């Protein structure tokens, strides 16, 4: 089967995390495989064996428990992280490194270079890494991250228009070349839906991709009611084209960068998360389509609330009965066993479980 087995029986959920200190325990695998068929493993998963072996070994372990699970290999399309065996290879190929207008190498940060996507020799190497993980490995697909950072028009000042345009085209080529490499049986997830006032990014790379991520629902620069509505409409729109949608939600704008939140004891972080799931969950359910997935936590480490559970995610949901309705800032949706209502302007919400 191509897509992960989807069901409306309960709220469809996915996982997106990395266990940075090692591979998952039998118990952690039981929890994850018992709750979802769709797992994206992040950079750094598996500990000091580095990401390729970490994700490959975890893919085996996941599908040993649940042969229907789809395990996706994270591979940033723009940033060179020292978390992969591949990093050592990239360091050995200065000839590819992205240079800025001023002749200096383009760094996002001191330890994270940015790729020159307009260099086909680099792209061939980049694809080979994803190809090895997916075709000659246990991953079922690749998660291509950082599209939003590639298209950022601030890059024009650093690269010039000509190089910027070539890099935007190089991104599309990277996707096409990735699809040609992994074939038609494997998945490509990409991170691109981002609703920011006057700078919205939608499902703008649909041709060769299967899943689109909504990373910042009701958080970061996407907190306005305009951006929240756009995010929900983009999930509905993308799901209607047949895409998988990953709806990444957050507990009342708290995250791993919110140190006031991260400083609280776990029992308190868990009381906050439990108390604030209704609004993002109702938003998800308002526009959710087939193959839409809900992720609710405060980070991308496994321990960032990734393995927390909530009673709302055990309740019977059933198939949608109508399309999402929009009455100004109020959104509603009906399911066989649930009626959804929320107000984007007041951030209040109500799920009536039947």
mmCIF file of C-alpha atoms in Angstrom:
data_model
loop_
_atom_site.group_PDB
_atom_site.id
_atom_site.type_symbol
_atom_site.label_atom_id
_atom_site.label_comp_id
_atom_site.label_asym_id
_atom_site.label_seq_id
_atom_site.Cartn_x
_atom_site.Cartn_y
_atom_site.Cartn_z
ATOM 1 C CA UNK A 1 0.000 0.000 0.000
ATOM 2 C CA UNK A 2 1.144 3.515 -0.900
ATOM 3 C CA UNK A 3 -0.314 5.742 1.824
ATOM 4 C CA UNK A 4 -0.401 4.798 5.506
ATOM 5 C CA UNK A 5 -3.647 3.044 6.369
ATOM 6 C CA UNK A 6 -6.037 5.861 7.304
ATOM 7 C CA UNK A 7 -9.091 5.680 9.558
ATOM 8 C CA UNK A 8 -11.621 8.130 11.001
ATOM 9 C CA UNK A 9 -12.376 5.781 13.926
ATOM 10 C CA UNK A 10 -10.467 8.156 16.216
ATOM 11 C CA UNK A 11 -8.660 11.426 15.550
ATOM 12 C CA UNK A 12 -6.018 10.510 12.933
ATOM 13 C CA UNK A 13 -2.604 11.213 14.448
ATOM 14 C CA UNK A 14 0.989 11.061 13.235
ATOM 15 C CA UNK A 15 4.389 11.319 14.907
ATOM 16 C CA UNK A 16 7.312 13.592 14.059
ATOM 17 C CA UNK A 17 10.267 13.386 16.430
ATOM 18 C CA UNK A 18 13.850 12.343 17.065
ATOM 19 C CA UNK A 19 15.089 10.506 20.150
ATOM 20 C CA UNK A 20 18.439 12.275 20.367
ATOM 21 C CA UNK A 21 20.074 9.977 22.951
ATOM 22 C CA UNK A 22 19.434 6.603 21.306
ATOM 23 C CA UNK A 23 16.932 4.269 19.718
ATOM 24 C CA UNK A 24 13.417 3.724 21.014
ATOM 25 C CA UNK A 25 12.551 1.233 23.732
ATOM 26 C CA UNK A 26 10.078 -1.597 23.207
ATOM 27 C CA UNK A 27 7.635 0.421 25.313
ATOM 28 C CA UNK A 28 8.133 3.597 23.278
ATOM 29 C CA UNK A 29 7.677 1.593 20.073
ATOM 30 C CA UNK A 30 4.496 0.005 21.441
ATOM 31 C CA UNK A 31 3.010 3.416 22.254
ATOM 32 C CA UNK A 32 3.863 4.906 18.862
ATOM 33 C CA UNK A 33 2.849 1.924 16.727
ATOM 34 C CA UNK A 34 -0.316 1.469 18.809
ATOM 35 C CA UNK A 35 -1.409 5.054 18.062
ATOM 36 C CA UNK A 36 -0.357 5.783 14.463
ATOM 37 C CA UNK A 37 0.726 4.224 11.171
ATOM 38 C CA UNK A 38 2.649 7.336 10.078
ATOM 39 C CA UNK A 39 5.955 8.343 11.681
ATOM 40 C CA UNK A 40 8.470 10.952 10.539
ATOM 41 C CA UNK A 41 11.841 10.465 12.237
ATOM 42 C CA UNK A 42 13.841 13.672 12.569
ATOM 43 C CA UNK A 43 17.502 14.545 12.215
ATOM 44 C CA UNK A 44 19.478 13.127 15.119
ATOM 45 C CA UNK A 45 17.264 10.114 15.810
ATOM 46 C CA UNK A 46 19.060 7.100 17.253
ATOM 47 C CA UNK A 47 21.867 8.871 19.098
ATOM 48 C CA UNK A 48 25.574 8.697 18.307
ATOM 49 C CA UNK A 49 25.161 6.157 15.490
ATOM 50 C CA UNK A 50 23.891 9.220 13.557
ATOM 51 C CA UNK A 51 20.666 9.667 11.649
ATOM 52 C CA UNK A 52 21.012 7.256 8.716
ATOM 53 C CA UNK A 53 21.646 4.183 10.868
ATOM 54 C CA UNK A 54 19.277 5.490 13.534
ATOM 55 C CA UNK A 55 16.316 5.861 11.191
ATOM 56 C CA UNK A 56 17.146 2.649 9.317
ATOM 57 C CA UNK A 57 17.293 0.613 12.529
ATOM 58 C CA UNK A 58 14.165 2.254 13.943
ATOM 59 C CA UNK A 59 12.245 1.670 10.707
ATOM 60 C CA UNK A 60 12.912 -2.067 11.044
ATOM 61 C CA UNK A 61 11.872 -2.036 14.698
ATOM 62 C CA UNK A 62 8.700 -0.056 13.976
ATOM 63 C CA UNK A 63 7.565 -2.310 11.135
ATOM 64 C CA UNK A 64 8.521 -5.434 13.082
ATOM 65 C CA UNK A 65 5.652 -4.431 15.385
ATOM 66 C CA UNK A 66 3.375 -2.875 12.751
ATOM 67 C CA UNK A 67 4.163 -3.942 9.169
ATOM 68 C CA UNK A 68 1.625 -1.373 7.917
ATOM 69 C CA UNK A 69 3.463 1.617 9.406
ATOM 70 C CA UNK A 70 5.084 4.182 7.117
ATOM 71 C CA UNK A 71 8.408 5.476 8.463
ATOM 72 C CA UNK A 72 9.815 8.573 6.761
ATOM 73 C CA UNK A 73 13.480 9.594 6.622
ATOM 74 C CA UNK A 74 14.123 13.257 7.435
ATOM 75 C CA UNK A 75 16.532 14.911 4.986
ATOM 76 C CA UNK A 76 16.787 18.702 4.994
ATOM 77 C CA UNK A 77 16.734 20.119 1.461
ATOM 78 C CA UNK A 78 18.650 23.273 2.444
ATOM 79 C CA UNK A 79 20.716 22.873 5.650
ATOM 80 C CA UNK A 80 23.822 20.774 6.355
ATOM 81 C CA UNK A 81 23.533 19.390 9.898
ATOM 82 C CA UNK A 82 26.305 17.503 11.711
ATOM 83 C CA UNK A 83 23.914 14.669 12.548
ATOM 84 C CA UNK A 84 24.472 12.398 9.524
ATOM 85 C CA UNK A 85 27.283 10.300 8.147
ATOM 86 C CA UNK A 86 26.497 12.315 5.010
ATOM 87 C CA UNK A 87 27.800 15.455 6.725
ATOM 88 C CA UNK A 88 31.362 14.132 6.556
ATOM 89 C CA UNK A 89 30.932 13.655 2.822
ATOM 90 C CA UNK A 90 29.515 17.166 2.349
ATOM 91 C CA UNK A 91 32.412 18.685 4.313
ATOM 92 C CA UNK A 92 34.729 16.947 1.817
ATOM 93 C CA UNK A 93 33.179 18.725 -1.199
ATOM 94 C CA UNK A 94 33.871 22.461 -0.966
ATOM 95 C CA UNK A 95 33.265 22.611 -4.722
ATOM 96 C CA UNK A 96 29.515 22.470 -3.972
ATOM 97 C CA UNK A 97 29.308 24.908 -1.067
ATOM 98 C CA UNK A 98 26.956 27.847 -1.510
ATOM 99 C CA UNK A 99 28.742 31.191 -1.835
ATOM 100 C CA UNK A 100 27.151 34.572 -1.166
ATOM 101 C CA UNK A 101 27.487 37.692 -3.312
ATOM 102 C CA UNK A 102 30.446 38.783 -1.159
ATOM 103 C CA UNK A 103 32.365 35.550 -1.940
ATOM 104 C CA UNK A 104 32.006 34.097 1.566
ATOM 105 C CA UNK A 105 30.357 30.736 2.151
ATOM 106 C CA UNK A 106 26.669 30.912 3.037
ATOM 107 C CA UNK A 107 26.055 29.811 6.634
ATOM 108 C CA UNK A 108 22.732 29.750 8.425
ATOM 109 C CA UNK A 109 24.750 29.344 11.632
ATOM 110 C CA UNK A 110 28.369 28.571 12.471
ATOM 111 C CA UNK A 111 27.786 24.802 12.221
ATOM 112 C CA UNK A 112 24.985 24.734 9.602
ATOM 113 C CA UNK A 113 25.877 25.600 6.016
ATOM 114 C CA UNK A 114 23.150 26.171 3.431
ATOM 115 C CA UNK A 115 23.056 24.147 0.223
ATOM 116 C CA UNK A 116 23.470 25.499 -3.306
ATOM 117 C CA UNK A 117 20.371 23.928 -4.833
ATOM 118 C CA UNK A 118 21.306 25.400 -8.240
ATOM 119 C CA UNK A 119 24.393 23.138 -8.328
ATOM 120 C CA UNK A 120 23.320 19.867 -10.019
ATOM 121 C CA UNK A 121 26.403 18.013 -8.767
ATOM 122 C CA UNK A 122 25.339 18.718 -5.188
ATOM 123 C CA UNK A 123 21.742 17.755 -5.976
ATOM 124 C CA UNK A 124 22.852 14.373 -7.331
ATOM 125 C CA UNK A 125 24.689 13.713 -4.066
ATOM 126 C CA UNK A 126 21.756 14.965 -1.988
ATOM 127 C CA UNK A 127 19.378 12.612 -3.798
ATOM 128 C CA UNK A 128 21.750 9.660 -3.374
ATOM 129 C CA UNK A 129 21.481 10.061 0.407
ATOM 130 C CA UNK A 130 17.681 9.959 0.287
ATOM 131 C CA UNK A 131 17.801 7.154 -2.287
ATOM 132 C CA UNK A 132 20.016 4.987 -0.075
ATOM 133 C CA UNK A 133 17.750 5.508 2.941
ATOM 134 C CA UNK A 134 14.527 4.767 1.047
ATOM 135 C CA UNK A 135 15.315 2.445 -1.872
ATOM 136 C CA UNK A 136 18.267 0.637 -0.257
ATOM 137 C CA UNK A 137 16.999 1.079 3.305
ATOM 138 C CA UNK A 138 13.982 0.516 5.509
ATOM 139 C CA UNK A 139 12.471 3.994 5.153
ATOM 140 C CA UNK A 140 9.229 4.329 3.197
ATOM 141 C CA UNK A 141 9.858 7.914 2.100
ATOM 142 C CA UNK A 142 11.739 11.153 2.611
ATOM 143 C CA UNK A 143 10.747 14.318 4.468
ATOM 144 C CA UNK A 144 12.171 17.294 2.550
ATOM 145 C CA UNK A 145 12.364 20.209 4.996
ATOM 146 C CA UNK A 146 13.205 23.897 4.743
ATOM 147 C CA UNK A 147 11.420 24.887 1.530
ATOM 148 C CA UNK A 148 10.222 27.992 3.375
ATOM 149 C CA UNK A 149 13.827 29.016 4.040
ATOM 150 C CA UNK A 150 14.844 28.489 0.404
ATOM 151 C CA UNK A 151 12.168 30.806 -0.995
ATOM 152 C CA UNK A 152 12.665 33.527 1.654
ATOM 153 C CA UNK A 153 13.123 36.662 -0.432
ATOM 154 C CA UNK A 154 15.680 37.928 2.072
ATOM 155 C CA UNK A 155 18.030 35.507 0.295
ATOM 156 C CA UNK A 156 18.036 37.780 -2.772
ATOM 157 C CA UNK A 157 20.110 40.328 -0.847
ATOM 158 C CA UNK A 158 22.686 37.609 -0.109
ATOM 159 C CA UNK A 159 22.697 35.839 -3.493
ATOM 160 C CA UNK A 160 21.429 38.277 -6.099
ATOM 161 C CA UNK A 161 18.335 37.792 -8.221
ATOM 162 C CA UNK A 162 19.927 35.509 -10.823
ATOM 163 C CA UNK A 163 21.290 33.048 -8.256
ATOM 164 C CA UNK A 164 18.072 33.247 -6.229
ATOM 165 C CA UNK A 165 15.983 32.335 -9.280
ATOM 166 C CA UNK A 166 18.327 29.473 -10.186
ATOM 167 C CA UNK A 167 18.066 28.146 -6.631
ATOM 168 C CA UNK A 168 14.259 28.283 -6.670
ATOM 169 C CA UNK A 169 14.273 26.253 -9.889
ATOM 170 C CA UNK A 170 16.900 23.952 -8.394
ATOM 171 C CA UNK A 171 14.482 23.181 -5.568
ATOM 172 C CA UNK A 172 11.782 22.014 -7.985
ATOM 173 C CA UNK A 173 14.421 19.945 -9.785
ATOM 174 C CA UNK A 174 15.559 18.419 -6.485
ATOM 175 C CA UNK A 175 12.006 17.184 -5.875
ATOM 176 C CA UNK A 176 11.660 15.793 -9.397
ATOM 177 C CA UNK A 177 15.073 14.140 -9.113
ATOM 178 C CA UNK A 178 14.133 12.689 -5.718
ATOM 179 C CA UNK A 179 10.936 11.210 -7.168
ATOM 180 C CA UNK A 180 12.874 9.686 -10.067
ATOM 181 C CA UNK A 181 15.305 8.134 -7.580
ATOM 182 C CA UNK A 182 12.898 6.586 -5.054
ATOM 183 C CA UNK A 183 10.301 5.437 -7.584
ATOM 184 C CA UNK A 184 6.529 5.393 -7.345
ATOM 185 C CA UNK A 185 6.128 3.165 -4.258
ATOM 186 C CA UNK A 186 7.685 5.610 -1.771
ATOM 187 C CA UNK A 187 6.524 8.849 -0.187
ATOM 188 C CA UNK A 188 7.819 12.409 -0.337
ATOM 189 C CA UNK A 189 6.755 14.681 2.514
ATOM 190 C CA UNK A 190 7.658 18.350 2.252
ATOM 191 C CA UNK A 191 7.437 21.257 4.573
ATOM 192 C CA UNK A 192 5.908 24.201 3.000
ATOM 193 C CA UNK A 193 2.468 25.360 4.096
ATOM 194 C CA UNK A 194 3.198 28.495 6.136
ATOM 195 C CA UNK A 195 0.595 31.234 6.619
ATOM 196 C CA UNK A 196 2.196 34.590 7.468
ATOM 197 C CA UNK A 197 0.430 37.893 6.644
ATOM 198 C CA UNK A 198 1.366 39.002 3.113
ATOM 199 C CA UNK A 199 3.900 36.142 2.842
ATOM 200 C CA UNK A 200 1.714 33.046 2.641
ATOM 201 C CA UNK A 201 3.159 29.798 1.305
ATOM 202 C CA UNK A 202 0.722 27.090 0.264
ATOM 203 C CA UNK A 203 0.878 23.632 -1.310
ATOM 204 C CA UNK A 204 3.163 25.030 -3.993
ATOM 205 C CA UNK A 205 5.073 21.825 -4.893
ATOM 206 C CA UNK A 206 2.253 19.326 -5.540
ATOM 207 C CA UNK A 207 3.377 17.478 -8.669
ATOM 208 C CA UNK A 208 5.776 14.862 -7.276
ATOM 209 C CA UNK A 209 4.919 15.077 -3.556
ATOM 210 C CA UNK A 210 2.461 13.095 -1.440
ATOM 211 C CA UNK A 211 2.329 14.938 1.890
ATOM 212 C CA UNK A 212 2.519 18.594 2.914
ATOM 213 C CA UNK A 213 3.248 19.814 6.441
ATOM 214 C CA UNK A 214 1.548 22.671 8.289
ATOM 215 C CA UNK A 215 4.253 23.239 10.878
ATOM 216 C CA UNK A 216 3.188 26.407 12.703
ATOM 217 C CA UNK A 217 -0.562 26.306 13.311
ATOM 218 C CA UNK A 218 -1.585 29.079 15.711
ATOM 219 C CA UNK A 219 2.031 29.673 16.740
ATOM 220 C CA UNK A 220 5.200 31.598 15.897
ATOM 221 C CA UNK A 221 4.416 34.019 13.023
ATOM 222 C CA UNK A 222 1.111 32.260 12.217
ATOM 223 C CA UNK A 223 -0.926 33.318 15.263
ATOM 224 C CA UNK A 224 -3.274 35.811 13.588
ATOM 225 C CA UNK A 225 -6.825 34.704 12.860
ATOM 226 C CA UNK A 226 -6.038 35.428 9.207
ATOM 227 C CA UNK A 227 -3.132 32.967 9.278
ATOM 228 C CA UNK A 228 -5.020 30.324 11.258
ATOM 229 C CA UNK A 229 -7.921 30.432 8.794
ATOM 230 C CA UNK A 230 -5.489 30.207 5.881
ATOM 231 C CA UNK A 231 -3.729 27.210 7.431
ATOM 232 C CA UNK A 232 -7.038 25.375 7.854
ATOM 233 C CA UNK A 233 -8.196 26.237 4.329
ATOM 234 C CA UNK A 234 -4.860 25.039 2.944
ATOM 235 C CA UNK A 235 -5.249 21.684 4.702
ATOM 236 C CA UNK A 236 -8.780 21.308 3.334
ATOM 237 C CA UNK A 237 -7.627 22.366 -0.134
ATOM 238 C CA UNK A 238 -4.588 20.071 -0.104
ATOM 239 C CA UNK A 239 -6.497 17.112 1.320
ATOM 240 C CA UNK A 240 -9.122 17.488 -1.404
ATOM 241 C CA UNK A 241 -6.395 17.039 -4.043
ATOM 242 C CA UNK A 242 -5.530 13.691 -2.425
ATOM 243 C CA UNK A 243 -2.493 14.873 -0.460
ATOM 244 C CA UNK A 244 -1.569 13.729 2.992
ATOM 245 C CA UNK A 245 -1.649 16.738 5.318
ATOM 246 C CA UNK A 246 0.299 16.859 8.581
ATOM 247 C CA UNK A 247 -1.298 19.426 10.893
ATOM 248 C CA UNK A 248 1.321 20.321 13.518
ATOM 249 C CA UNK A 249 -0.308 21.933 16.563
ATOM 250 C CA UNK A 250 1.086 23.407 19.766
ATOM 251 C CA UNK A 251 -0.134 23.804 23.363
ATOM 252 C CA UNK A 252 -1.255 27.447 23.580
ATOM 253 C CA UNK A 253 1.798 28.762 21.700
ATOM 254 C CA UNK A 254 4.198 26.933 24.037
ATOM 255 C CA UNK A 255 7.188 25.153 22.508
ATOM 256 C CA UNK A 256 10.752 24.059 23.206
ATOM 257 C CA UNK A 257 11.972 27.638 22.626
ATOM 258 C CA UNK A 258 9.575 28.929 25.326
ATOM 259 C CA UNK A 259 11.891 28.621 28.317
ATOM 260 C CA UNK A 260 9.269 29.739 30.843
ATOM 261 C CA UNK A 261 7.212 26.744 29.705
ATOM 262 C CA UNK A 262 10.174 24.372 29.429
ATOM 263 C CA UNK A 263 11.267 25.294 32.970
ATOM 264 C CA UNK A 264 8.023 24.000 34.494
ATOM 265 C CA UNK A 265 7.828 20.471 35.936
ATOM 266 C CA UNK A 266 6.538 17.811 33.573
ATOM 267 C CA UNK A 267 3.288 17.401 35.512
ATOM 268 C CA UNK A 268 2.637 21.109 34.904
ATOM 269 C CA UNK A 269 3.600 21.021 31.222
ATOM 270 C CA UNK A 270 1.194 18.089 30.920
ATOM 271 C CA UNK A 271 -1.646 19.905 32.687
ATOM 272 C CA UNK A 272 -1.179 22.826 30.288
ATOM 273 C CA UNK A 273 -1.085 20.624 27.184
ATOM 274 C CA UNK A 274 -4.157 18.669 28.302
ATOM 275 C CA UNK A 275 -6.044 21.906 28.984
ATOM 276 C CA UNK A 276 -5.246 23.530 25.615
ATOM 277 C CA UNK A 277 -5.780 20.709 23.098
ATOM 278 C CA UNK A 278 -9.401 21.622 22.318
ATOM 279 C CA UNK A 279 -8.792 24.673 20.121
ATOM 280 C CA UNK A 280 -6.059 23.195 17.864
ATOM 281 C CA UNK A 281 -7.875 19.853 17.711
ATOM 282 C CA UNK A 282 -11.135 21.553 16.726
ATOM 283 C CA UNK A 283 -9.240 23.586 14.129
ATOM 284 C CA UNK A 284 -7.746 20.376 12.745
ATOM 285 C CA UNK A 285 -11.104 18.588 12.696
ATOM 286 C CA UNK A 286 -12.824 21.612 11.144
ATOM 287 C CA UNK A 287 -10.847 21.275 7.910
ATOM 288 C CA UNK A 288 -9.464 17.754 8.205
ATOM 289 C CA UNK A 289 -9.758 15.605 5.085
ATOM 290 C CA UNK A 290 -8.934 11.994 4.332
ATOM 291 C CA UNK A 291 -5.220 11.413 5.001
ATOM 292 C CA UNK A 292 -5.039 14.481 7.280
ATOM 293 C CA UNK A 293 -3.030 13.925 10.458
ATOM 294 C CA UNK A 294 -2.914 15.688 13.823
ATOM 295 C CA UNK A 295 0.320 16.175 15.779
ATOM 296 C CA UNK A 296 0.062 17.866 19.186
ATOM 297 C CA UNK A 297 3.194 18.453 21.281
ATOM 298 C CA UNK A 298 5.727 21.191 22.065
ATOM 299 C CA UNK A 299 8.745 20.097 20.031
ATOM 300 C CA UNK A 300 10.484 17.655 17.729
ATOM 301 C CA UNK A 301 12.374 15.689 20.353
ATOM 302 C CA UNK A 302 10.580 12.518 21.399
ATOM 303 C CA UNK A 303 10.456 13.891 24.950
ATOM 304 C CA UNK A 304 8.942 17.239 23.879
ATOM 305 C CA UNK A 305 5.546 15.802 24.776
ATOM 306 C CA UNK A 306 5.796 13.496 21.770
ATOM 307 C CA UNK A 307 4.666 10.406 23.692
ATOM 308 C CA UNK A 308 1.949 12.150 25.718
ATOM 309 C CA UNK A 309 -1.628 11.034 25.131
ATOM 310 C CA UNK A 310 -4.979 12.728 25.608
ATOM 311 C CA UNK A 311 -8.519 11.378 26.086
ATOM 312 C CA UNK A 312 -9.757 13.416 23.116
ATOM 313 C CA UNK A 313 -7.610 11.230 20.838
ATOM 314 C CA UNK A 314 -9.316 8.047 22.108
ATOM 315 C CA UNK A 315 -12.909 9.196 21.570
ATOM 316 C CA UNK A 316 -14.943 7.863 18.665
ATOM 317 C CA UNK A 317 -14.943 10.336 15.767
ATOM 318 C CA UNK A 318 -16.237 8.694 12.582
ATOM 319 C CA UNK A 319 -16.361 9.960 9.028
ATOM 320 C CA UNK A 320 -17.130 13.610 8.243
ATOM 321 C CA UNK A 321 -20.785 14.189 7.410
ATOM 322 C CA UNK A 322 -20.450 17.585 5.686
ATOM 323 C CA UNK A 323 -17.879 20.044 4.384
ATOM 324 C CA UNK A 324 -16.257 22.658 6.585
ATOM 325 C CA UNK A 325 -18.571 25.627 7.108
ATOM 326 C CA UNK A 326 -17.305 29.191 7.491
ATOM 327 C CA UNK A 327 -19.377 31.879 9.230
ATOM 328 C CA UNK A 328 -16.862 34.735 9.411
ATOM 329 C CA UNK A 329 -14.337 33.651 12.087
ATOM 330 C CA UNK A 330 -16.432 30.661 13.229
ATOM 331 C CA UNK A 331 -15.657 27.253 11.706
ATOM 332 C CA UNK A 332 -17.850 24.167 12.037
ATOM 333 C CA UNK A 333 -17.708 20.550 10.900
ATOM 334 C CA UNK A 334 -19.879 17.494 11.541
ATOM 335 C CA UNK A 335 -18.648 13.933 12.053
ATOM 336 C CA UNK A 336 -20.656 10.758 12.610
ATOM 337 C CA UNK A 337 -19.888 10.925 16.347
ATOM 338 C CA UNK A 338 -18.728 14.522 16.830
ATOM 339 C CA UNK A 339 -19.717 18.099 16.032
ATOM 340 C CA UNK A 340 -16.896 20.650 15.876
ATOM 341 C CA UNK A 341 -17.064 24.391 16.528
ATOM 342 C CA UNK A 342 -14.412 27.057 17.037
ATOM 343 C CA UNK A 343 -14.004 30.829 16.792
ATOM 344 C CA UNK A 344 -10.642 31.904 15.391
ATOM 345 C CA UNK A 345 -11.030 35.448 16.738
ATOM 346 C CA UNK A 346 -11.582 34.408 20.375
ATOM 347 C CA UNK A 347 -9.585 31.136 20.177
ATOM 348 C CA UNK A 348 -12.465 29.398 21.987
ATOM 349 C CA UNK A 349 -13.658 26.012 20.785
ATOM 350 C CA UNK A 350 -16.098 23.211 21.547
ATOM 351 C CA UNK A 351 -16.143 19.566 20.443
ATOM 352 C CA UNK A 352 -19.467 17.840 21.160
ATOM 353 C CA UNK A 353 -18.675 14.124 21.215
ATOM 354 C CA UNK A 354 -21.696 11.908 20.539
#
